[PDB]
Amino acid sequence: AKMLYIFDLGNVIVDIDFNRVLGAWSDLTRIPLASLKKSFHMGEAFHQHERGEISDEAFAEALCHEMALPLSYEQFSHGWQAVFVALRPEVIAIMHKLREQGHRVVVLSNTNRLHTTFWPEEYPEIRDAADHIYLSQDLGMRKPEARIYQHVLQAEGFSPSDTVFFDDNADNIEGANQLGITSILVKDKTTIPDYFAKV
Amino acid sequence: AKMLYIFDLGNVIVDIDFNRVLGAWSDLTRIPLASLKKSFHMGEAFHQHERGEISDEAFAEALCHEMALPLSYEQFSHGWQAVFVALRPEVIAIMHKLREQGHRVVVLSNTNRLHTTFWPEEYPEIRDAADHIYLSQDLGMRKPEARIYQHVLQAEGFSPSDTVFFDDNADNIEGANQLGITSILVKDKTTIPDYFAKV
Ligand SMILES: O=P(O)(O)O[C@H]1O[C@H](CO)[C@@H](O)[C@H](O)[C@H]1O
Ligand SMILES: O=P(O)(O)O[C@H]1O[C@H](CO)[C@@H](O)[C@H](O)[C@H]1O
Ligand SMILES: [Mg+2]
Ligand SMILES: [Mg+2]
Numbered sequence: 001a002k003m004l005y006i007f008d009l010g011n012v013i014v015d016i017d018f019n020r021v022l023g024a025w026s027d028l029t030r031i032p033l034a035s036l037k038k039s040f041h042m043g044e045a046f047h048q049h050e051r052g053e054i055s056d057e058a059f060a061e062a063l064c065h066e067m068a069l070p071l072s073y074e075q076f077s078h079g080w081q082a083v084f085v086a087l088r089p090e091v092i093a094i095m096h097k098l099r100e101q102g103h104r105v106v107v108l109s110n111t112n113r114l115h116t117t118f119w120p121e122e123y124p125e126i127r128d129a130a131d132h133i134y135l136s137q138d139l140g141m142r143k144p145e146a147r148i149y150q151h152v153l154q155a156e157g158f159s160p161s162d163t164v165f166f167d168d169n170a171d172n173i174e175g176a177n178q179l180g181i182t183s184i185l186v187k188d189k190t191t192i193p194d195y196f197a198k199v
Numbered sequence: 200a201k202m203l204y205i206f207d208l209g210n211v212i213v214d215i216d217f218n219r220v221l222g223a224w225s226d227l228t229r230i231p232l233a234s235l236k237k238s239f240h241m242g243e244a245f246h247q248h249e250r251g252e253i254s255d256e257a258f259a260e261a262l263c264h265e266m267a268l269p270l271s272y273e274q275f276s277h278g279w280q281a282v283f284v285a286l287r288p289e290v291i292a293i294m295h296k297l298r299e300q301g302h303r304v305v306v307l308s309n310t311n312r313l314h315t316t317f318w319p320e321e322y323p324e325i326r327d328a329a330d331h332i333y334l335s336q337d338l339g340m341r342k343p344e345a346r347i348y349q350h351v352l353q354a355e356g357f358s359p360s361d362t363v364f365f366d367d368n369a370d371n372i373e374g375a376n377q378l379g380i381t382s383i384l385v386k387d388k389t390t391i392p393d394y395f396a397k398v
Contacts, residue, residue, distance in 0.1 A: 020317075028317070033323065078276065078315060078316070081277050082280050082316075084285075086283075116277060118278070118281050122226050
């Protein structure tokens, strides 16, 4: 009985920290890091950029306006590229193992990649570990929208009861739950190893 | 009796991995990562760039020629910015502790930073933990040259016997040893904690 495993990317397959991006912008503009952190809000520009509805340049524009950043696109993108990203090799190992057992393994990420940046979903380690990588920007959809989960289920050909989904965001978990997907909130680095050790 | 502690940066205060840079360049140009790794040599351009003797653009030029990379400066710099860097918080903690004990704490790094990149020596965590950061590009000198160590000793006003130097590079250790500096090869993450626990 082959299963579909859907893994969140950010804070699930990788550790990711945007404080390094703000550090880069602070260093360039001399605007204190704390001031950048205070004005760094997830709002409409994020939701739209993630669904591919506004360009990288428009996304960069909106953030720079909101944060009073006097940056060119190149400077914005350079800072963005500095994002801290560390693989969780224990998760990669599980993904490889699930696949050699014949289970379907996919990634589902709301991505803010730019055309100018090398981003985690493009990392060979991650690309090697998954059958398919579903990205919000390619689909025109984002978690926690019902439609994104439905799109994955249809594309992969799995019913909700044959599907297991890991994500560290409660809204994302709720959105998948509503479709009857078995959804496990990732609380920390122990959640996924514990799940796959303990049965 | 106040001491001078000199800490290497790369692979001593931080973990650093240029494979992520090559990954970025590979992703952009489609040239296989392995081919980039094979042609990524530390040669004259590195030595010169580290001492500030050639520009960022000239450094980028030399590497792109050597590796057959069809990149603009911006693309080169963007890839370079992607370098993996993780703090070793245990080292930062020691640096803060040594200073509150009244000892002198400095960093000594052969840096390949670009004017366009946010680089580890600029990280507030590192800047907060050191009295001074000595960078090869600012000095026109590089480890393992006798002159760079001498410059630090003179600037800080410490004799070699009052100085302790940590670096993971054997040539760097040898170069400091020759001036009578107590020099500890950093073999791994345990070397520095062990040194400061065990007396
Ligand atoms: O962006 P993704 O891969 O959906 O997922 C990530 O987004 C946020 C920003 O990176 C993180 O804080 C979330 O915890 C994580 O799942
Ligand atoms: O460049 P730095 O800070 O002198 O030091 C670093 O240089 C190299 C490249 O990053 C590393 O492999 C060395 O191990 C490290 O000490
Ligand atoms: Mg890319
Ligand atoms: Mg800088």
